Amino acid sequence: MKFTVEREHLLKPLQQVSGPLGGRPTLPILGNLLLQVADGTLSLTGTDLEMEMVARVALVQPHEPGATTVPARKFFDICRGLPEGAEIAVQLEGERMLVRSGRSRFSLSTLPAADFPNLDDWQSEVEFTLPQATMKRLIEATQFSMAHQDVRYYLNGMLFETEGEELRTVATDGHRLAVCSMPIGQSLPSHSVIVPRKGVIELMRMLDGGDNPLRVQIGSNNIRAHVGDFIFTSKLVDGRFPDYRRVLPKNPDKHLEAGCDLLKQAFARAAILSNEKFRGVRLYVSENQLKITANNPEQEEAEEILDVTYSGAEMEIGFNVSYVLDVLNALKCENVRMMLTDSVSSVQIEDAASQSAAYVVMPMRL
Amino acid sequence: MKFTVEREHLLKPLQQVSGPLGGRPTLPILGNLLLQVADGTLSLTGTDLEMEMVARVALVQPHEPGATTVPARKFFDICRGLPEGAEIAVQLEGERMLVRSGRSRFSLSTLPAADFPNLDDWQSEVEFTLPQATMKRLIEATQFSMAHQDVRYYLNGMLFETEGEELRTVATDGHRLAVCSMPIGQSLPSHSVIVPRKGVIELMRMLDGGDNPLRVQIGSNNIRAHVGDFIFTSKLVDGRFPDYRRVLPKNPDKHLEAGCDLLKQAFARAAILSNEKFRGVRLYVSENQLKITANNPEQEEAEEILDVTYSGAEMEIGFNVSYVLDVLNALKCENVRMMLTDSVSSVQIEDAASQSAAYVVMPMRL
Numbered sequence A, B: 001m002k003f004t005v006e007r008e009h010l011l012k013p014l015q016q017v018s019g020p021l022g023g024r025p026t027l028p029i030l031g032n033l034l035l036q037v038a039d040g041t042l043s044l045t046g047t048d049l050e051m052e053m054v055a056r057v058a059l060v061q062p063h064e065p066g067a068t069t070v071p072a073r074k075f076f077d078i079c080r081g082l083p084e085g086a087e088i089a090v091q092l093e094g095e096r097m098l099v100r101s102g103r104s105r106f107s108l109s110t111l112p113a114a115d116f117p118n119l120d121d122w123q124s125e126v127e128f129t130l131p132q133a134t135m136k137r138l139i140e141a142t143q144f145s146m147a148h149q150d151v152r153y154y155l156n157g158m159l160f161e162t163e164g165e166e167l168r169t170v171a172t173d174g175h176r177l178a179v180c181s182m183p184i185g186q187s188l189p190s191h192s193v194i195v196p197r198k199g200v201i202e203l204m205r206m207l208d209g210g211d212n213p214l215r216v217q218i219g220s221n222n223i224r225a226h227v228g229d230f231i232f233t234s235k236l237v238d239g240r241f242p243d244y245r246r247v248l249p250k251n252p253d254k255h256l257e258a259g260c261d262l263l264k265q266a267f268a269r270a271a272i273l274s275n276e277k278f279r280g281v282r283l284y285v286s287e288n289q290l291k292i293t294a295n296n297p298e299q300e301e302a303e304e305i306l307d308v309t310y311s312g313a314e315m316e317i318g319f320n321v322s323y324v325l326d327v328l329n330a331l332k333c334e335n336v337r338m339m340l341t342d343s344v345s346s347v348q349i350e351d352a353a354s355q356s357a358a359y360v361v362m363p364m365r366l
């Protein structure tokens, strides 16, 4: 195996394939990157067994086929450490991989490429393409609502659902939920899968914000995403997701509208004096006015009064303020709409000018 | 106690006095800020018993004398969280302090001002003024060489020494030393004190950069720095700090000069393959050439060859590469000079064009 490539041509690829790592590398080989030269292309692969990232780099300079694996972080750091514009010559010599550039020489240990975890092939059942910007919007709109390491393991990820020509994402931890739908101009079969939390993060990281479109393939137990010369594959969570449609409040009779910035700031200040652990705050809605209060075990209290658009009956309701702030932070719009029912029902929050995303938060009793 | 002031006038002061406070210290009182209204001035004080920060704010609007203490972080967050241009009205009420602005209202818990830790009075023995920029340079030039939780408590701090018309800082952890001297245009007595690590951090944090002069007063067991309307006071560390004069090599005969960036990047790349805990690298000096090598337990190897200016005898010597990189990272000059004597003695590193600072690093066995 032999190849020579410009440092700048390796940086992005190396950065993208090092992602699968980071976790607890009980197995040494998982700390390595698989390098394969074949048909005039260098392929770099990183994996943690649950997912893998593959990057292909065209070789415009002399090369020889072969494969091996080397310590990921060390190889990446060596390449990044070389000067801008450096030509990196790599050759496999026995049980070591040599990296030479200018008057800098490195000899790295290797592990057989034949021993590198090889994720089995699978068949895609659903496929579609969409702008990177659309995937970014879908994940960013709901990611914060995923559970971390909940016993309800199927919540430690994000639902990706296809229906008609829409692609939708849903995330929930059982107490608050986020859903975002976007039409992608392609007839799709009705299908739903859950992508693991780490997979969602990796998918988001692969979007450079360029024009390169994203091609997605979903199988029975895996999902693959193609962007430019990068291919990310992840196992899917083997479980079923909650009925989010039932979560969305039937027909709320109360409607409140207010500036997103003013509302966020009011809740943020009030939160300061809320219980550090349970974070409860109370809302008092009345004719065109909202009063937010909060108190803690130290008997400290905060009160915010804001002008809002509301003409329904007066009502009081409590909420975990962190859940509310998470939603307002996710909504980068001018005005927000809160749809209420009563003090013992959840609230649905949306951008007042768009129904593309909806947030539902359970109320807190007190 | 009562006062009304523009939010803008409270921002910097609150930030400065909240610094000496950490994540809710052992004693509850230390988590509070002391507020005092007297003679048309609002004074804010924060302390951790070891050091104290006092900020004064002129009160132009109507006020009433008095004192109390309130949760530091909460009061700061409330003020910072209010909108730009907000006016903040504060008044003491029973066991609570009320903060009002617009239609935002807060009631904070209090602790008697009479219980707030009060640093004992002391007498200044050494006094001088100097530009903030000079103090910043003195600290930044040596801070990285201070010890970290060493049992030789005196090494965990920074020596501040006055001699002639110069102020000098010295820092060492017993393995490497850093010394920097700067002229301040004033005749001073020969004196030296040790400022605690935390005190050094706090001192640096109070320096913004403005032409606002820094006034320093040093006592037998205290140091005070006054900048604008901010006064910082800290206890000193009682111990015998080592003499840098006896550490600096005497007429070292082997001088090597090289570009700082090139030398730094060479050591940085070699370091990747050095022992992870011991970090040893070997230097081979010869006519206008430097070779740096590194190897680790798994026999991985790095070699860097650089052109340098050197006409001394050939020699090999080892060093902890982290110590070398720390020095090269602290210097922001174009060229560096390394001065050596033999294989079992320390190296002195300095800006080839300035003797304002000097660094000494102990050698490392093969």
Ligand SMILES: CCOc1cc(C[C@H]2SC(=S)N(CC(=O)O)C2=O)c(Br)c(Br)c1O
Pocket (backbone or CB within 6 Å): A172, A173, A174, A175, A176, A177, A241, A242, A243, A244, A247, A346, A360, A361, A362
């Ligand atoms: C009045 C009910 O209100 C809410 C209910 C849920 C989710 C629950 S209900 C339910 S049945 N299952 C199991 C399922 O669907 O498999 C759930 O997980 C959420 Br998240 C929110 Br936010 C609600 O406001």
Ligand SMILES: CCOc1cc(C[C@H]2SC(=S)N(CC(=O)O)C2=O)c(Br)c(Br)c1O
Pocket (backbone or CB within 6 Å): B152, B172, B173, B174, B175, B176, B177, B242, B246, B247, B346, B360, B361, B362
């Ligand atoms: C001939 C002496 O040479 C050096 C001495 C030091 C100072 C250290 S060693 C040591 S014992 N103590 C006292 C202590 O035990 O705290 C120190 O402070 C340094 Br850093 C360097 Br680099 C030297 O080359």
